[PDB]
């Protein structure tokens, strides 16, 4: 809603003041002034889907009578901590020392925000541990992604659906889907590991569709102009292409996948069309939607079905 | 450090590797975990481990003798390895900025929080220790940013080379994680939470940290390469060195123009011109006076140490740096 978006965006200026203009580090004003610009440039622009998802999750997990402006604001601050992590990850991926240090500094700042607003609450240690664990798992995901590339060349023998599913889970789904919902759960004082486990099984399945759709639209979407083929990325399209390819089609992937020449991108796009990847994606979208929806209906305990259907409608519709 | 202290500390390392890579977790991604074990083994346990062993020595000299069990000294060792994980992440990053990727650097640092949760999450010192690592991380980042702001394009900004800025760089970039972190970890593991005690320690440790870096800066230009086993490149790299800061303080207009023209140039001739100016400006004699004056100030601050802190810990740390 407009009200949700506006109240969330209104928190950002207070976070910048907390990190750069709170009377700390008085001997190095040039660094804190510059850090405020780094935050202002890199963190609050474009869509804040992960941050707003944290507030939505909290609103639908908490007891209606506990949903106070103060508590919704705490959910918003957790949302901004997720956006500080998102900004650190985006900046690094765009860069790939002053630039690199800025990404580490943005990520490090979220723990200062957690200490200021949550150190006095029971959810403090669970939330800190969640951020630590998600950071470790994200690093493992980036490492698996990099093990699909040798020199500047994609290793197509590594492009298996099993490896693809693991990359998406660790590199993307944990911090994009699990982190917002688990933060909402902890702020609502839901600590039952079985509740977090059940949420995870669903959110990892939604996360996999989210990235497969992103991969499909990289090549077949209507105008950014997608560069997955050029960059030799382990994309769902490349994985399914290798499954469906005859030896002659496999040779085309080996020769042209991950080449910089615009003709090589066109050759791969044409092969994807020849292999019927658009039709294969259409079938996956319908079947995955139906399968996840069945799994949400089987969700027991005090987990609201409503939250997972809302997340689905955002991604699928 | 004693033979027993060193051997007991080194015995912990293979456990931390198994804890992080071979304890039944991340069952679906064995290629990544097997690789990460090699990243830890190849980068973390090699060389001197001064910061890690300093954490152990700090704990042993701060804790009540009756509480110094093998189990507690082993927890001090695990905290020391958490400092060495941080140190390995910073050293890998320095080497990449001059096989391993940037992501490995992030992964090695992230792993220390997994070790902290495993071994300390049950103790009252847990949140203080986590918050100390978070704060030292943020301050180290600020130090690295301040250091980077002394360079514009590929050239040093000599107007930025002030003693005030140099002192702030050494404090935030180096002294907090190298000197404060080991001692504050030792204090927290000994259930010493008094901010006055942490601040008393900090006053001394930041003074030791400043001499540590000033001596390192001096030896970069004036050290014996065959003795130190490294050829110094601070002049070529245009680093905000104590030598450069003091040179600019002592320089007449003609001497300053030599720094403007030749400081941070790749040509070996330019390194010799700057070294000759450092000799002309009496930087060796200035360093000798500083070493004597700083030793005496630090020795007195340690003699004066209060808040029930042990003077012998800080004398041991000082003695190691001044030799
Ligand atoms: Mg994409
Ligand atoms: Mg040096």
Numbering used by the authors:
A (entry chain A): 87 to 182, 202 to 328, 333 to 426
B (entry chain B): 86 to 183, 202 to 426
What does the literature reporting this entry say, word for word?
Each subunit (subA and subB) consists of 13 helices (αA to αJ and α1 to α3). In both chains, the N terminus and C terminus as well as the loops between αD–αE (183–201) and αH–α1 (329–332) are disordered. The FARM region (179–183) is partially resolved, while D319 of the SARM (319–323) coordinates a pentahydrated Mg2+ at site B (Mg2+B).
Here we characterize a metal-dependent, bifunctional isoprenyl diphosphate synthase from the leaf beetle Phaedon cochleariae by structural and functional analyses. Isoprenyl diphosphate synthase in P. cochleariae (PcIDS1, EC 2.5.1.1) produces FPP in the presence of Mg2+, but preferably forms GPP when exposed to the heavy metal ions (HMIs) Co2+ or Mn2+. Inter- and intramolecular cooperative effects in the homodimer strongly depend on the provided metal ions and regulate the biosynthetic flux of terpene precursors to either biological defence or physiological development. Strikingly, a unique chain length determination domain adapts to form geranyl or farnesyl pyrophosphate by altering enzyme symmetry and ligand affinity between both subunits.
